[PDB]
A paper describes a structure:
Dehydroquinate dehydratase (DHQD) catalyzes the conversion of 3-dehydroquinic acid (DHQ) into 3-dehydroshikimic acid in the mid stage of the shikimate pathway, which is essential for the biosynthesis of aromatic amino acids and folates. Here, we report two the crystal structures of type II DHQD (CgDHQD) derived from Corynebacterium glutamicum, which is a widely used industrial platform organism. The enzyme forms a homododecamer consisting of four trimers with three interfacial active sites.
We determined the structures for CgDHQDWT with the citrate at a resolution of 1.80Å and CgDHQDR19A with DHQ complexed forms at a resolution of 2.00 Å, respectively. The asymmetric unit of the citrate- and DHQ-bound structures contained four and six molecules, respectively, highly homologous with alpha carbon, with root mean square deviation values within 0.2. The citrate ion exerts a weak inhibitory effect on DHQD, which is enzyme-dependent. The CgDHQD structure in complex with the citrate ion exhibits two different binding modes of the molecule. The citrate ions bound in two CgDHQD chains in the asymmetric unit are stabilized by the side chains of R19, Y24, N75, H81, H101, S103, and R112 and the main chains of S103 and I102. The citrate-binding mode is similar in that the stabilization of 3-carboxyl and 3-hydroxyl groups resembles that of 1-carboxyl and 1-hydroxyl groups of DHQ, as observed in the structure of Helicobacter pylori DHQD. However, the other binding mode of citrate in the other chains in the asymmetric unit is uncommon, wherein the molecule is accommodated in the active site with a half-opened lid loop. This unique binding mode illustrates the possibility of various interactions for inhibitor binding that do not mimic perfectly fitted substrate binding.
Author numbering:
A (entry chain B), C (entry chain B), F (entry chain B): 3 to 146
B (entry chain C), D (entry chain C), I (entry chain C): 2 to 148
E (entry chain A), H (entry chain A), L (entry chain A): 2 to 147
G (entry chain D), J (entry chain D), K (entry chain D): 2 to 146
Write the structure that this text describes.
Amino acid sequence: GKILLLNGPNLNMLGKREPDIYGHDTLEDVVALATAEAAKHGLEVEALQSNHEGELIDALHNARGTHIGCVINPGGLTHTSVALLDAVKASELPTVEVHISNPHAREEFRHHSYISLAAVSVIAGAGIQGYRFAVDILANLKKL
Amino acid sequence: PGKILLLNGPNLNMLGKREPDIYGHDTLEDVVALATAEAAKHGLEVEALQSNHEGELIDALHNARGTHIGCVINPGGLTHTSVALLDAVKASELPTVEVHISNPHAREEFRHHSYISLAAVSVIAGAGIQGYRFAVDILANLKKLEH
Amino acid sequence: GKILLLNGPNLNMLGKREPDIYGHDTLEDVVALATAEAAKHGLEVEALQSNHEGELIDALHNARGTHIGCVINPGGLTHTSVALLDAVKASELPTVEVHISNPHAREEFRHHSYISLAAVSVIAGAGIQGYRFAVDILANLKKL
Amino acid sequence: PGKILLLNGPNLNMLGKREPDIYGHDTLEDVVALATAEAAKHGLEVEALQSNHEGELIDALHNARGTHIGCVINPGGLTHTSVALLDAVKASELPTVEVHISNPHAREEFRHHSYISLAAVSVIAGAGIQGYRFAVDILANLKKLEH
Amino acid sequence: PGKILLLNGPNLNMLGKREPDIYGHDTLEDVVALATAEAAKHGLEVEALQSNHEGELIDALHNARGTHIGCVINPGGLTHTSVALLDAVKASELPTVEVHISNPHAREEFRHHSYISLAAVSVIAGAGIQGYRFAVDILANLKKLE
Amino acid sequence: GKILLLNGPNLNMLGKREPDIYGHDTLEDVVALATAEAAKHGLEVEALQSNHEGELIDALHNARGTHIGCVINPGGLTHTSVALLDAVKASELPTVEVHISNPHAREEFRHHSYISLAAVSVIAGAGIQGYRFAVDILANLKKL
Amino acid sequence: PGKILLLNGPNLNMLGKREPDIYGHDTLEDVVALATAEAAKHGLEVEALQSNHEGELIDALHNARGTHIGCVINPGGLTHTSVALLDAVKASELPTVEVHISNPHAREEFRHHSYISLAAVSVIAGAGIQGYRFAVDILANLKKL
Amino acid sequence: PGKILLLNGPNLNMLGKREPDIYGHDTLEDVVALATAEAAKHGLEVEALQSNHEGELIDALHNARGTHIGCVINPGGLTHTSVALLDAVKASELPTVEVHISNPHAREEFRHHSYISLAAVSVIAGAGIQGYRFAVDILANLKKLE
Amino acid sequence: PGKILLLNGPNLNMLGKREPDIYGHDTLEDVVALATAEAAKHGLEVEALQSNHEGELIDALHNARGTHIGCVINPGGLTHTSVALLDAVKASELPTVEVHISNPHAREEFRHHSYISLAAVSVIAGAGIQGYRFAVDILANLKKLEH
Amino acid sequence: PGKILLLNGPNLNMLGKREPDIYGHDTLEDVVALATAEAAKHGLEVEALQSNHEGELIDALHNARGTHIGCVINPGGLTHTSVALLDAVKASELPTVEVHISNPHAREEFRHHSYISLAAVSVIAGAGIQGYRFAVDILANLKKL
Amino acid sequence: PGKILLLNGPNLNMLGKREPDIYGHDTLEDVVALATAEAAKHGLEVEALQSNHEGELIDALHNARGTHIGCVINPGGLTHTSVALLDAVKASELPTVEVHISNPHAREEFRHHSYISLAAVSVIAGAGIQGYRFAVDILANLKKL
Amino acid sequence: PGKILLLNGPNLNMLGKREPDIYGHDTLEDVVALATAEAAKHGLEVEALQSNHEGELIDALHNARGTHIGCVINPGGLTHTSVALLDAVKASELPTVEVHISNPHAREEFRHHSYISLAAVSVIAGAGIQGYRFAVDILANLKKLE
């Protein structure tokens, strides 16, 4: 069983700026944590990070029927992309939306999510542990 | 070690009653049991309170200041309306996880705003009652001065 | 057969200020009128007035399955309380919303009603006779 | 004693035709009959007019000034759009009850505003055609200088 | 002689009895008489129409194209609501003066917008029925220059 | 088989102002084009143009069950009339909304259409050819 | 003997030069001349002020309280922006006619709102400088009643 | 002697420990003591109630009708949200002074609206707990004139 | 004579896959075939491109400037969001017909705004894939300096 | 020795005459008198200015920088409209108490917003002229700490 | 010979003192000096005015009509509020470059709107006092063409 | 020498032919040449990239972190729409000058908002391609002080 792990724009920079101020956790840390949780359920993870909205949409489309679900952190595309929302819908994958930080503690333009309209679940502000909980949700939906 | 304050707001006592094949079969008892079981995995306890009275939830937040490690709250309809409850979360100084069973963003526009999200360390929506399990996990693992 | 008659905040003050300016009708008048109409249909009325939103919600919850319907004048909670709307829904009682005055002739913040989203019927500006008409609606829905 | 002006606006002539098991089987004839029967209980008469033409309803309001005791109106879609109809209600000086068969607040956002509600003594929504019966009862019992 | 189209929209037939504290006690007959007297000073005539029917005002505008020097219009409630009536004023090509008896910008917020003001050469509000007299003056003097 | 062709306020003035600036096409041109397209499908056209909203509503009501569909250019009523929207719904006719010009290139108050909420299809800015395409849509829906 | 306060707000001194396709070829001198001549037909006088300084218009309104029969005002850009000027019109207790040379409701959205229209007995827009003549007519005939 | 109703809404019991950088270190006891001392200067008494329950504040207002010279209220969060509490202030007929410790108009936009300000005779914000002292002064002097 | 640029935006490749009895059975291949067939009736050709990448559609618009007679575009979700795509339509100077298969006005409020409608000569919504056929007809018949 | 800058903005000179049912029968002289007498109880002086000219209030704020302990201001209609005046209060670095005689949040919606409240340490509304006395009390006791 | 009108609106006289973390440590004297020196490199002169009085800026715009090659303006808080000043820029017919020391679109929402940007040929924000140098460069080179 | 990243977003490759009445007749080559000449005056180089692809601009920003003294960006349409691009400017830690050829605040209301202005040190609009010259000047002089 395979989960699609998608990380959107800027997520490649996790842990790359001064980590004492901007965080020590890296994208590799995110993938490893999601992968280890998936392994507890006999599942695998296909991970992709891209600063290109089209590469995420292509990935969602290509995973239709082949994956049990999608964990997505869309980054700034959260607030802006109808096309990304329509790609989650077209994929027909049960999708969990993850934010490492709590967008509602940030600027008001970050409060709105298009993805939240189609996501089965939304996890914000749990740090990279949101990706662990997202894998648990998809593992357990699939079992039901 | 320590105690988590579990707060369920108005209407949460009625979980599982209306059209369960559409809205869910899980009950408030199931919620408290699931959170209490996850807390035990971390050597923690849960003090659960459900109320239809905003002031009862505010009283509980105030009384838990300095004696509890954190709060898991599902404010129900107060989520969208109560400044006083947000100020009670801040006054408690409890690190707070906001939980919704359903995804409010899939519902009416008035349900898309949360006062509690402004102060919550984390917000979990649409994971069913599993949201409460992940909330207990977050509070168990939070360290002083994180983020 | 029993109808739940709920009166929200401030309704206890009906008829208590100078009645020539603020009205002669009292809460007792409201309960008696609803009760007499209910009696015409072989029905009874359980009446509660509270300045506490929680006492109304508790009442709605406790009347689930035991009452044929709810007549509610929510007072200022009309415009503000999502929790009260969700309590009407959770009660599963057919609910008639009553306003003694016409809110639409008052300040604009009184124009919006959360209760109107779940109420079967809304009666405004008929004075205390709105409670009579509300009982008639519930008596006749029950008969069908 | 006296005559009530019963006004039904655009589309009310088509009551009972579209998906009646969902929207209703009652007809305009049923509405006029029900209001006329309630009026008779109070020694009153009804003059009923339905029109798809705003100006016909305005003409009728003007012509009823001083000769009728009040107006029961269901403006249909004009409810949300017509300042001229509101001004015609005011010009008629008829105490006016606004009636909707369905509850407009359960429908699209544009149906939540009513110009007529600003001038109406009473507004009844969602009582089916029984709304017209209660409206006649209100006008029968209204006293000069009430509220 | 040249002719001015005087159009009064819904409810203006009720002038005199209609909310006098707002509209005064002057009647539609008084409005037409004053406009007619002012036009005569300029050697002009007035063709007056009041209707409660938006389509009658539109028909009148179309039918006045090319035979009238201009239009004086009080659209009443239709002021705030009718795109169709604005489009009829434009299609008539009549220089159009918009008149209101009350001052709508001192009244409810729903009266603050005017479709007709987008096409009117001039707008007069709150001058009781004298607005119609000034409107005729505007049109007589526009025609003299053009 | 009959199509109801409705033209709303001001459409009678098509081609009547200086045509080099305001257009040469006339209402007669619109009716002839729709009629000729309908004839290609063995269908007829009943055409009505009115500056009166009530005459359009009456027409829609009277065509219930007797016509295969309605082509409507509502003119300025597009943006304003809930009553006209409710008349399209009450008619139960499959309805195509036509604009000769593109309203979205005009003032912002012309961007909103009530009719678009009930119309099966919306054609804007194709000139009078939008009426031809509207007839094609209704001919082909009827065949299915 | 009866006196009308004629106030013109910012930029009105530039009439005849300022954006002629919007405001026309008439001058502030033409405006004052027309208002003055109309007032004389009613046996009234005109005290005219134009200023680019809001405070000078407000002082003029206060100073005319109880001594003048009314005010004709074209506030210019202050029409859309100044609560202080609205409050000065109300403090003056002068019946006030608001005049605009241009039709503001045919221009940018920010010109659609007028604080002065909340207190004005009458508003005239788009009649060129003739709006000032009609405004004197209004004030002359309100006083006469 | 005359009596002033001092009402503090939700969270004000936590004054002292609650967000001191915003609310200061003065306690509810300090608030009640200062109001009580000021009232005594005017030969008046204070009946103080704090509650986290909107209905207890409403009950208190109803029950103070006709036995209190006025009300000093800090509604806390309910300021921005409660029509019911405004309606209770109105029904009490108590001359009402609205007090805020912080300046809400310098804070989040959701704190910029006040239902209570629609019925309050006066509103004092941002004067720490001294707002309650000035509020008592307002009510003592209103009563002296009326 | 000449070539029409047919652009289909994000997700249009997935046409016909999700709940086809509800959303439709027609495919992107059907769209290209229908537009290509109508173009042939007018002695015209079609260059079709579908992409999930906004920049690919912008590149295509730029590369078609002066070499194509017009553009038929269904921007998909970019309709509501992309200023850059509107500016690419303007930079191409291609007369452009905007096509939607479904009627966006019957859907969520955010789908009611189109940047492309501001520059498009025509907008067709809700004619199914027949919209693309009418779009090709419009471009075939457009004359220089019309309207 | 300590000096308080007392500023009154447009129309305040008309107190006692201007819309008495809203503003009452007290005068600007009563306001300055009350503020002056309260300041004296704290051993402070008052420098009072009223102007219908925004620029005169802004100059006064700049000129009081570093020499005064605080500002009491009633901006009048400028309360709702002037970013320049807010920026003048911030440039002054004076602790500022905003005073309104009327309760603006009980009046027209356009009076609900105050640029000055963004910088003011305190806002008093609806206490008649007594708000100016409480404002001096605030400034006296902030300085004392 | 060619003359540039340099206008600074309210509070700009307080540069170097006013909220240094937002506006920096440069003075109005530094601003005028930099603009003057840049204009000289193009053989142009600068006529500089700063005022806390909107009416003084409007008078300056009118008085520079036809005699000056362009205007560099920092309107201060009036940027967001004054239709009268926008209309004065249009009446002047001067090519106008709008300058802000701070980046207003990085500050409070009420600073996001500029009436002046509707008429300005160019807008420079956040370049400190160097924006005034670039503004002279723009005006010098528009005139040269 | 130090290097400045010059980024041009969608449609700017079409400068010269694109709506000249709005953007002028200067080409992207001219933009790059002018920025390059100005940088040389300060002993600096320019690395220029134009793309119609938001992700290529983001990749460029990430890849320029720590090797460039600053960024000059004209985001084109993405200005008003892209949170992702703002977040990339922030993550790059490059002092960033935002440049527009046209004055967007004199144009459609949808052009009035800029995400990039929230992180840019400076914003220059409406100076034709000279905005890029001033932008280089800003970055050369910021670097000299820091």
